[model samples]
Target: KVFGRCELAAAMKRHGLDNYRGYSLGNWVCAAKFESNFNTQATNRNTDGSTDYGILQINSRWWCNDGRTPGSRNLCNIPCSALLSSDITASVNCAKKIVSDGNGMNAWVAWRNRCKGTDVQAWIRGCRL
Candidate 1:
């Protein structure tokens, strides 16, 4: 279920990037590894029946209309299933759009910061495509 190397490579290509040498793909794969192991159909803790976490590990309650907040509002309100339905290319594109209108690479740096206590390099190796 994990987004293996081929998938990641394709995702990079979809993002108009020549390689996954740095933070973009690296951060994405890293998050997927921890969230659902790249399991596109995976779901996690749910509060309301409609709120379930899915691949990309996005919590519906935190990032969607179905969230706990009265109007917390999802950035795109696009269905998570739709985002995860296709291959990595679609997945990463959606992620980029959600992160910052195709500027998600900027947020990748934040992901690295969060992994300061762990072996990010090792994580990167595991996420290698």
Candidate 2:
């Protein structure tokens, strides 16, 4: 797994994601908690013939490729399996790209459905930087 909440925050900060693209690390922490509970190996199959990958639950439909799927843009240029790793450098980088693509954190359904406008400060509670 990549992190517990605090560890994830610290890592995000180290990667300059503390307030990246105007989105707080807390936003990421909150979303990640609901998305994967910090589990790097997390994967979910969607009814739309797409699979979400890794802690961020990045979709194969737009981000990475499982190789068997056709028409996958693979914008992150990494194998979808690469996202499911204890090391999250690639995942974090790709997430940044997604945010930059104008999707912001809203690209994450968990962020929109669960974190947006919620009191997400609790996600970072009691965590040392």
Candidate 3:
């Protein structure tokens, strides 16, 4: 795991991610929790034969290439392993690209299925931004 709750919040803030691209910090925090539990190395296989990578669970179908997935666009131009690291710089930058592409956090199944329209305040409740 790359961070505890407070540490994750601090890193998110330091990355200038709070309210980034109009998405709330709480939304991002909540998504991270459900997606990877703040573990940078987290990787999950999706039903569609794609995989989710890193804390944000970005999909191999579009955001990254794992080399195992065929026909991956890799819009972020990064290896899937790059997202799985203690340094979240690449992950954060790629996330911003995703959000800018009109997905916001909705590109993440965790965000769409678990965080949308919810009270995400608790995700950052004890953390100072």
Candidate 4:
């Protein structure tokens, strides 16, 4: 399922992404735009054979077990398949874990390049959070 801009913003906030680890909710929304454009079924297979999955594009390299990435820790403890669902619960929950791991939103390259050092709140302008 594809989410509209403000729709995704609301969902992110509702899912406990608001001001998570000193970063505002809009940062996730902005990262989602670059990561998967709000498409729940998105995936990116890396050259290292790991894949990124779902709206937030959670990587199989460290977060989830896709059964293909070499030496995957599967720190999120959920199957990589879970990240592709429209529900977004697993993806959001895992993202919370990621930021808590000292990476902050830097875990996502798109956020570092696009959302960081910018007015992320612009992404949630019309949302009634």
RMSD of each: 5.2, 1.3, 1.5, 0.9
lDDT of each: 0.52, 0.86, 0.86, 0.91
Worst 10 residues of 4 by lDDT: 120-129
Task: Kindly list the per-residue Cα lDDT of model 4 for residues 1-129, writing each as its tens digit.
Answer: 999999999888888898999988889899999999999999999998899999999988888998899987799999999998879899999999999998788888999999999998899997777
Clashing pairs in 3: none
lDDT of 2 by residue, 28-74 (tens): 88888899989999999887778999888999988898975667689
Clashes of each: 2, 0, 0, 0
lDDT of 3 by residue, 1-129 (tens): 578988888888889888898877888888888889999999889777899889888889988988877777999999889999899888999999999998667777878899889897888887766
- Please identify which of the two predictions, 1 or 2, would achieve the higher lDDT against the true structure: 2
- Scored by lDDT, model 2 comes in at 0.86
Prediction 4 global C-alpha lDDT: 0.91
Clashes of 3: 0
Q: What is the lDDT of residue 116 in candidate 2?
A: 89
Task: Pick the winner on lDDT between candidates 3 and 4.
Answer: 4
Q: After superposition, how far is residue 30 of candidate 4 from its true place, in Å?
A: 0.3
| lDDT for 120 (candidate 4) | 87
Among these predictions, the greatest lDDT belongs to 4
Ranking by TM-score: 4, 2, 3, 1
